[PDB]
Amino acid sequence: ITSGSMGGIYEYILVIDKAKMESLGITSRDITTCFHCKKFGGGKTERARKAMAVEDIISRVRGGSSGWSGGLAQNR
Amino acid sequence: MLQCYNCPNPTADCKTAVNCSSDFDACLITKAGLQVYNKCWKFEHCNFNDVTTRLRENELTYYCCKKDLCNFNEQLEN
Structure with missing residues (x-):
């Protein structure tokens, strides 16, 4: 080594990403007729939901005491 | 009284025939x-x-009819 800085560093990163997607679809027919009277119906429906979250945090302290390096790593 | 097929569970050829209670007025097939x-x-x-x-x-x-015991499989072509 032939240069120096003596000091302390603190670094903190937080990323959060979330997504939600939902969809619903329906198609239907209803019928009635009379000639005796008669009634019919027929159809389909589909539904979907998804949800995602990621939370990533990194905190690091390079410095001067185990106690307060830990404390600062916890609670800025 | 209304009279229909009224099987307790889905049955590909429902034979269970009943007079319906006053709760009911139609025979459904699905x-x-x-x-x-x-x-x-x-x-x-x-x-x-x-x-x-x-x-x-x-x-x-699905289909619905009023006549006695009228809700039967061939009523639906699906």
Whole structure:
């Protein structure tokens, strides 16, 4: 080594990403007729939901005491 | 009295025939893929929202009729 800085560093990163997607679809027919009277119906429906979250945090302290390096790593 | 097929569970050829209680005024059939349902029902309950929610089925066809024991499998071509 032939240069120096003596000091302390603190670094903190937080990323959060979330997504939600939902969809619903329906198609239907209803019928009635009379000639005796008669009634019919027929159809389909589909539904979907998804949800995602990621939370990533990194905190690091390079410095001067185990106690307060830990404390600062916890609670800025 | 109303008279319908009213099988206790989906049955591909429902034979269980009953006089319906006063709760019912129509005979429903539904075909729901593998399943077939024949029930004492009501023409007001013969609505796709009801049939779909109450059967918990995604794709189906259903028919309702007034005559005695009239709700039978060949009534639906599906």
